[PDB]
Design an enzyme around this catalytic site. Structure first.
Site, short mmCIF file in Angstrom:
data_model
loop_
_atom_site.label_atom_id
_atom_site.label_comp_id
_atom_site.label_asym_id
_atom_site.label_seq_id
_atom_site.Cartn_x
_atom_site.Cartn_y
_atom_site.Cartn_z
N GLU A 263 26.45 80.44 137.47
CA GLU A 263 27.33 80.34 138.62
C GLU A 263 26.47 79.83 139.77
O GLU A 263 25.39 80.35 140.03
CB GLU A 263 27.92 81.71 138.99
N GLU B 73 35.05 85.27 150.27
CA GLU B 73 35.05 86.51 149.51
C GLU B 73 35.16 87.60 150.57
O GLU B 73 34.30 87.71 151.43
CB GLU B 73 33.74 86.72 148.76
#
Length: 223
Positions: free
Chosen positions: A116, A204
């Site tokens: 990621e 986020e």
């Protein structure tokens, strides 16, 4: 389009705006994503949220994404992107970032991968990337703290590389492939055996609010 349930998407190929409250049950609150302008040339949207509880755990990652022909990272020519965003209320725990996943299997689910790559344009509150800082690098004419860590769930390990800016970058553009190039030459990233399978950008949210994250415009392509 107004999206307030757990998982919703609005799209205009190749772009999409996604409501994604995957960590919703870890706390209490509400969040909706509002599509301001969505077309084949880019996405404009905003999200308002309030979350409490489960400190340190992400409640959501509302984002805009782009679809593209999945291919080997070593075969990627360029990943041009541009964005202008703003955060209203910084007394929160959250981050603003690009999130890309790669996997040895081109059929891998797009919600995660073997690797990621995260590019943090802003960090708010006491949150920090996964792992620890292993370097500071200059990519695209800018300096970034390079973080690395791994996580394991349901038997699958995910190695995460996060590039973090020192201060908020509200207007950004560049070639994301430059980050893969750095990882390949300086951190032994297996570019010739990893497929790029997802590219998203959003925020986020951990705790705090009411807050509003606005994306004035976002473009991205994978060549």
């Amino acid at each position: 389009q107004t999206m307030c349930s757990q998982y919703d998407s609005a799209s205009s190929p190749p772009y999409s705006v996604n409501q994604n409250l995957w960590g919703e049950y870890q706390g209490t609150g509400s969040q909706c994503v509002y599509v301001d302008k969505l077309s084949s040339s880019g996405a404009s949207w905003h999200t308002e949220w309030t979350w409490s509880g489960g400190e340190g755990t992400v409640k959501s990652y509302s984002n805009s994404g782009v679809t593209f022909n999945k291919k080997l990272v070593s075969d990627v020519s360029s990943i041009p992107t541009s964005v202008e965003w703003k955060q209203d209320n910084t007394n929160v725990n959250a981050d603003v970032a690009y999130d890309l996943f790669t996997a040895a299997n081109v059929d891998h689910a797009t919600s995660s991968g073997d690797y990621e790559l995260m590019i943090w344009l802003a960090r708010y509150g006491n949150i920090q990337p996964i792992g620890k800082q292993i370097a500071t690098a200059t990519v695209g004419g800018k300096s970034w703290e390079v973080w690395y860590g791994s996580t394991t769930q349901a038997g699958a390990e995910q190695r995460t590389y996060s590039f973090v800016s020192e201060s908020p970058i509200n207007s950004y553009s560049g070639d994301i492939n430059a980050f893969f190039s750095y990882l390949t030459q300086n951190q032994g990233f297996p570019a010739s055996s990893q497929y790029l399978i997802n590219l998203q950008f959003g925020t986020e949210a951990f705790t705090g609010g009411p807050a509003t994250f606005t994306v004035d415009n976002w473009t991205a392509s994978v060549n």
